[PDB]
């Protein structure tokens, strides 16, 4: 229905309460639009997203249980209806070259933030793990 | 200097005479802005560029003698002054994924168009090689 309901209905489902909102983090870093890495941190800190993307428990390491769903939401957020996991993976490759995110070799769909997110976010990985009830 | 000088000076150097100008090719394919594969076909058919990129003589195979210069011009053409071969190399990977350009095994900076450029361009490799005095 209306936007008032959209907010209320989603608030009932415990949506829209991430610890690290992509939009807020973009204002902090001054990037304007949200970037992919900020979008991932938002899902990783949103309890309502732990079914398709979650922390593993080892530092800044995370896995995409449903890679297609992550590409689907990224497409919804950037108005890219033709977004799929092939294109999202292609983008993550540029994050590799920049030493922002690394692939965990030996696991499928598992990566790790290798930039100093602690000094950036002011959170340690374990702190967020407890806030999110990571197993 | 002025624009009339910029065009005359480049003319005296036998520049601006590529057999396959990226812009002309883009209009032919209706792609709008030039794409990387078109930009490469421009350098590869521009005699003033044979120092850093050229054909090898074996069909649609070519080598980047100065990979940095190729990434530098692609940067100037798309207003990406921070362009380098690492980013350009990911770009070529996209054409690998799409079976448009493959890597020559065991050789660095050596690629081959594996699409059907002869049907698209109306040229054979040997025809262009003769026009370009390829050794």
């Amino acid at each position: 229905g209306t936007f008032k309901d959209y907010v209320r209905d989603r608030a009932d489902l415990n949506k829209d309460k991430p610890v690290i909102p992509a939009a807020a983090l973009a204002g902090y870093t001054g990037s304007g639009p949200i970037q992919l890495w900020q979008f991932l941190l938002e899902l990783l800190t949103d309890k309502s997203c732990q079914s398709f993307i979650s922390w593993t428990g080892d530092g800044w390491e995370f896995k995409l249980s449903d890679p297609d769903e992550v590409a689907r939401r990224w497409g919804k957020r950037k108005n890219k209806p033709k977004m799929n996991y092939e294109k999202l993976s292609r983008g993550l490759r540029y994050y590799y070259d920049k030493n922002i995110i690394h692939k965990t070799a030996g696991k499928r769909y598992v990566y790790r933030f290798v930039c100093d997110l602690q000094s950036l976010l002011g959170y340690t990985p374990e702190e967020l793990h407890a806030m999110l009830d990571v197993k | 200097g002025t624009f009339k000088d910029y065009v005359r000076d480049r003319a005296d150097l036998n520049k601006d005479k590529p057999v396959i100008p990226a812009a002309a090719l883009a209009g032919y394919t209706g792609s709008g802005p030039i794409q990387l594969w078109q930009f490469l076909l421009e350098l590869l058919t521009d005699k003033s560029c044979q120092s850093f990129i050229s054909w090898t003589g074996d069909g649609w195979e070519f080598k980047l003698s100065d990979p940095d210069e190729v990434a530098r011009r692609w940067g100037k053409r798309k207003n990406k002054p921070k362009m380098n071969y690492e980013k350009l190399s990911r770009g070529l990977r996209y054409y690998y994924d799409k079976n448009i350009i493959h890597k020559t095994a065991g050789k660095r900076y050596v690629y081959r168009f594996v699409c059907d450029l002869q049907s698209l361009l109306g040229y054979t490799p040997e025809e262009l090689h003769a026009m370009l005095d390829v050794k």
Partner: peptide, 16 residues
């Protein structure tokens, strides 16, 4: 650390 643009032909950044 810095976060340069992630904008390419095979992976274009959105804006508007």
């Amino acid at each position: 650390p810095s976060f340069d643009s992630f904008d390419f032909e095979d992976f274009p950044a959105a804006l508007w």
